[PDB]
């Protein structure tokens, strides 16, 4: 029913990871500090594509492609699977 | 391309002729085996076995490996017919005192360590 | 499990079952069949004999290497059982003959043998104990093989109150004398049966399928202090039966009435052999006696075992009792018998 | 270098050489190889193409004369495209001579059978059959010879196990011999013995 | 050195005797279990040491080339005897 | 102490620059299942075990001792899975038998973060089982079967979690220095005054550390030729 | 004449294994590592395959060790690493491969054994 954690599988050096590689370079700070307990597990990824992990209760998993996506369109993302939305 | 040289048959057509063709003749001679061998089953469970080992291989898709398969098949229906097998080799094929093994995994993991 | 005792391998010749079983009984039609399940899986089997050495030779290839243990035993000895079974975690008792010999009247083989094992393998620490009696066994039955049956049931639950108990009913094979018998009867003429075998339903079991059982209730945990009947799919009228017999053997089929006075008698002048009797009163008495129902105790489907029907199995006995005209003819030729079920 | 030695024999290396000179200028269709190893024996390799034509020639020819087909085998090399190499060995009465001609296949690639040039290979063939796998094109007879009946795979395969995969043994429940998948009491114990220091320094390949 | 196991069995010059649960037993009833009595180890201990004149001594077993091969042992450590890898006899040089 | 180490690191990046990929900042790790189980997202540390005692407790090759059952409550169920009798196993209710390093095929992740992956050598002893396979059994007898039955499967899981635990012998990362940085220097604990000693102050402590060691004659040895002079 | 197959090598059906040997086994591609207790480098030239262990147990007679894996002795020898990935592909065996590892290139000196500043000066020799 709500967040137990987060997974973010970028990838080091691939054009289609360079803005989520920008997310973290400037807002996952501040988005760690809005949720101090919430685990975002930013983890490295091979070259098939950037992704986004939401787990919720009793280990109920989905996916997000963040595959060519720019920090905001990143950051959204992250905000609407943070809210009651989606 | 790829540069293969055939052995019989030149596309999946003609290899498929040949199969229903070998597949006619281990269908007519069935119930000679059973009774030449004096065989305690059937002639349907024959026919069933001949069908379950031509279906064994119904993934093939190379003309060459299929032509391979009827040289092989007819090799053993010859063998069938002029009595070189005897009742131990046809039985063999049903596998009469070979226990179950089982294929789910938690019988799997009762009984030991292989997969 | 004692680590000497933990399954080990794929179950083949040259594995560990962790099973270790003194097979009383291993020389006769059910004996052969139950060492060799037992040896297939790799077993350690312990066979105590008092026949000829001879005899049990068809016994030594079902095992591999060390996994045979041949020990001389008397039935009348109790510190011979003890030898036999102080290693053993399982005892299966197959000890039984048909007809009552000078030194071992039927008292002898189904209640003072059945009890002295019971008693030492309980003594022993013997684990699990498996009796074998009939289906029909009964303390008031016309005939004695099956009152006595009862008795050592009785007797084997109070000195064993763990053992399991199977009750299978005319087991048929290649050396069964059940099917054996009707096939027997061609060469005097004509089958004489009592009433026509109209009054009398059997409901025949296969050896394997008993030989089976028998393993399973030994890995079964929950089957140890149970009661098990073993009998097969079909019944049928004991007339039909012979009929689909005699037709099978494609032996002319002469069925004639015999009265039971008349039929006691040619068992009491055919039990004065000797050797081995071709009938006696007590199998006249047991043929034409109708299989008990009893579906209150649980079956071979309880131990997981599919019962096979005696049309499938027929053949492979009755062959070897026709003549060479019909030697090579199929099985499914012969118009499977009448079934009265329910 | 007298005594223990393996003496040398010049004269014939130099006429073996030359007559693998010979062979590889009237069949340039062919031949692909020519060696003269250091003990005198003569090895032609060819391209499978060439069988039927080569041994006719080799056989046929006033100056070959090759009537007799010593032995006929197979070689299986993993590490090769073509798996397996055929080999002939053939035998010159008139010239008392010696001759080896080699070819290739792999596993789904028929080779002529030559049963036509010598009556001998007949049971070569099939025994290469059974043992490799190979098959041979326009054979009288092609069927197992060596294994038992039934038996699935080729044994002589590098990749074939040792033992197999079934044994046999007398069931007493069915009455008759069955096969089963093998399982055995003592293990086949595999001994590393290659020494790590190298024994012929003529034979060392270069180190890529 | 032969002894008993609390079963009744016979200790091997191995030490292997099957332990009381071990239903491997049953192999010997009606028959016997084989067991070599002359134990080795206590055979080799009471052969005398040799007293040798000489700081390295050498041994071949006996018997020339019917023995082990030829060793050499040194005899500098005087709290110990130069024992043979091959026979077991013991050296040692005259001390005290 | 890391904040600390942390702001000597940030000192050293800001004055002399970052000359590349050079990554001044290290820890360095002596088990050899906490880089796996950190990358895997697993709470490093006992202290939530104290906050909320539970009422069934997994040990999973747990025989450090740091928490026994003074500190859960009563009633508690113990199910302990290892291939060794330790401190973890005389405490449990259900023990499981599990595969040592030298029976399975399994992935470890060193101090580097390099993923390598051992290969079997002899199988389990008796009834013991691979440890991934008895928790995907227990899975399915409670209903709620896990979704890999194969071993590529449950990798395939692991790298659906933690993709660089499939890379074998890869040991490239990102810096994120800069951040962790940011996040340390939010809270202000205090040090303690205690001096810092090492676990293992001499040689005759590296010998007998975890329970494969405890149990090994040869490390007795060395610990009394160590203590004792003789 | 040639027909122009399109299709992948796949020779499982012909080779006569067991299913059971085909699907569930594992083999390992890789340059055997050089025994530690010598310094000859000769078994260090060609590639290896061999498959996983599988299941050994206790005879109970001799005690002597039982297998029912019939692949647990097979070692084949390859050229190259792709020689090998193809066999193992066409015969249908899912493999692992490990690229082959040299000891790296090593500045050797006798001489700085007697540095007359540095730490490499030998205190015996
Ligand atoms: C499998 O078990 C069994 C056996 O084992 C092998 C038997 O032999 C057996 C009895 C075997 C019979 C064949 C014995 C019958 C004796 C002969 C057939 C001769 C019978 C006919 C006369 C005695 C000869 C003269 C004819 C008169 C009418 C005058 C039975 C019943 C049996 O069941
Ligand atoms: N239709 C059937 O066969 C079914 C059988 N019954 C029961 O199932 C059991 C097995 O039947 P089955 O195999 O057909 O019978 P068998 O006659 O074929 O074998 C009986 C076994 O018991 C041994 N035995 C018999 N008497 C003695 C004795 N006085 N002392 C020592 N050993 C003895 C025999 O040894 P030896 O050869 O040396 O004499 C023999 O091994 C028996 O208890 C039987 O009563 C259950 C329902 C019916
Ligand atoms: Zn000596």
Redesign the interface.
Known sequence: LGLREIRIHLCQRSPGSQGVRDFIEKRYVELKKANPDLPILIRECSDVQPKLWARYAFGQEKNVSLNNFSADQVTRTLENVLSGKA | GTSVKPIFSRDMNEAKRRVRELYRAWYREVPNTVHLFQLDISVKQGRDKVREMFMKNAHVTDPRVVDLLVIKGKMELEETINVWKQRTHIMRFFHETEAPRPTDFLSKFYVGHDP | LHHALIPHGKGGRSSVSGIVATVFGATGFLGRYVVNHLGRMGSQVIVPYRCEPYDTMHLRPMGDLGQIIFMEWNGKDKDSIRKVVEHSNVVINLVGREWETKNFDFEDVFVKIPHAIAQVSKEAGVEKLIHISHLNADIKSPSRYLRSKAVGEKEVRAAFPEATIIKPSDIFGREDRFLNYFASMRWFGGVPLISLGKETVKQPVYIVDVSKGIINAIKDPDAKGKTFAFVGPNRYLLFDLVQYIFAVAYRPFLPYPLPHFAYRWVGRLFEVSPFEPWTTRDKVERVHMSDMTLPHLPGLEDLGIQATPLELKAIEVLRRHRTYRWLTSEMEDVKPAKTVNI | TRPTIRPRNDVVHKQLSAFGQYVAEILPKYVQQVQVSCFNELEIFIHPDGVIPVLTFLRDHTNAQFKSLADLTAVDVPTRQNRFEIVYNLLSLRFNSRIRVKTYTDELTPIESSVTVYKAANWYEREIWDMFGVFFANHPDLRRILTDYGFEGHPFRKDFPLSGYVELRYDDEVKRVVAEPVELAQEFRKFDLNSPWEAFPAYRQPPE | GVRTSPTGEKVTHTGQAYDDGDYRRVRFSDRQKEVNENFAIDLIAEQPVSEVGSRVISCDGGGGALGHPRVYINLDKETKTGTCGYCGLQFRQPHH | ILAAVSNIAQNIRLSSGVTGDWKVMNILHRIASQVAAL?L?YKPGVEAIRKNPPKVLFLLGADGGCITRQDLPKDCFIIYQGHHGDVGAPMADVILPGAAYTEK?ATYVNTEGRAQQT??????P??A??DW?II??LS??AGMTLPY????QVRSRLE?????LV?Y?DV???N?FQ?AN??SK?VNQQLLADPLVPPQLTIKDFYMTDSISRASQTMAKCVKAVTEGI | QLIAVDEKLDITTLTGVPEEHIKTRKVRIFVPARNNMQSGVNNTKKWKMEFDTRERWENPLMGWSSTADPLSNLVLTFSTKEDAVAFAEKNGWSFDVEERKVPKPKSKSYGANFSWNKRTRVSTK
């Open positions: 990358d997202g095929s290969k079997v050598a002899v199988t389990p008796g009834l089982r691979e396979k995907r059994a399915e007898i039955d194969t071993l590529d659906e979690v933690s993709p660089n890379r012998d490239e990362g990102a994120y951040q940011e996040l939010l």
